[PDB]
Design a protein. Structure first.
Lengths: 50, 51
């Protein structure tokens, strides 16, 4: 019928009670959607004279 | 000679002769033994079922 995705939030895990045959199209996409992310350090400087 | 009749209990009766018996027994035994209903399945590795 449809794909019903439910997310827990209290263990930070999600379910998939949807098609029992093409779930592979979900494992691939979540695997491409869970990835460590790099972070950047920003510093700015200003100066003047009067 | 013989006759043939049907009852909802699938009786199959005749009188005939005694040589006729051979030919007709052989008839039904061959034609009924022609591969009546049997069931078998197949699993499936990964593809969709209901589809």
């Amino acid at each position: 019928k449809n794909i019903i995705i439910k997310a827990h939030g209290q263990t930070n895990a999600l379910i998939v009670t949807a098609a029992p045959d093409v779930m592979n199209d979900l494992e691939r996409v979540i695997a491409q959607l869970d990835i460590r992310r790099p972070q950047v350090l920003v510093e700015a400087i200003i100066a003047e004279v009067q | 000679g013989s006759v043939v009749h049907y009852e909802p209990s699938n009786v199959l009766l005749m009188t005939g002769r005694a040589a006729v018996i051979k030919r007709l027994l052989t008839i039904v035994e061959r034609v009924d033994n022609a591969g009546d209903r049997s069931v078998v399945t197949v699993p499936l590795s990964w593809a969709s079922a209901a589809e």
